[PDB]
């Protein structure tokens, strides 16, 4: 490994993902693929439905913040979306890192690399609200360790 | 919870629902993203379509009550 886990340069479409193995709090980082198409949302790597709707909530928040973020005016309908977590599906309470998918697809759609040393996890609302996380402890351990 | 989750401030786009799971009824914060486009029922949250048509009866009532609520 690189020592600080921030020697990664800032990256389009990839952020550091605080998530939980049953082994524990881990950097299950985020992998996306945003290419033009039908606007379809593939989940790649056994990612479950709660991650699918989390991606929908992130998608619709971007829809609410399109020219806010300089996005194309039609992106959800012609840019196919393919996303990964190294864990297949999260055995925990949903993904607990909906904003991590949001951040990665934001960096992907901006064509502008988001930073590293991202110590983050949390649940987007389609209303646009970062839901509180259950089990802050091991997530922030996965940050700090 | 805060001093009172009922005393949480008024919310745009969503409302305090009423449930009964057999182990206990809950608030149902039914959240809706009014996303632009042309009309696409992008329902989610393991949604059964009877709630979809409930929302559609709501939708056509809003169509009936566009100037009751200043809607376009």
From TrEMBL, chain B:
It comes from the Bacteria. Mg(2+) binds at residue 18. Induction: By heat shock. It is found in: Cytoplasm. Homohexamer. Organized in a ring with a central cavity. Belongs to the peptidase S16 family. ATP-dependent serine protease that mediates the selective degradation of mutant and abnormal proteins as well as certain short-lived regulatory proteins. Required for cellular homeostasis and for survival from DNA damage and developmental changes induced by stress. Degrades polypeptides processively to yield small peptide fragments that are 5 to 10 amino acids long. Binds to DNA in a double-stranded, site-specific manner. This is Lon protease. It comes from Meiothermus taiwanensis. The chain holds residues 583 to 654 of 793 of the full protein.
């Amino acid at each position: 490994y690189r020592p600080d886990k921030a020697e990664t340069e800032p990256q389009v479409g990839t952020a550091q993902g605080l998530a939980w193995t049953p082994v524990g709090g881990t950097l299950l980082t985020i992998e996306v693929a945003a290419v033009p198409g039908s606007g379809k949302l593939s989940l790649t790597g056994q990612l479950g439905e709660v991650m699918k709707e989390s991606a929908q909530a992130a998608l619709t928040y971007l829809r609410a913040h399109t020219q806010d973020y300089g996005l194309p005016e039609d992106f959800y309908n012609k840019v196919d979306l393919h996303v990964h977590v190294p864990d297949g599906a999260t055995p925990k309470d949903g993904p607990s890192a909906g904003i991590t998918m949001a951040t990665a697809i934001a960096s992907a759609l901006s064509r502008r690399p988001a930073r590293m040393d991202i110590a983050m996890t949390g649940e987007v609302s389609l209303r646009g609200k970062v839901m509180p996380i259950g089990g802050v402890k091991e997530k922030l351990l996965a940050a700090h360790q």
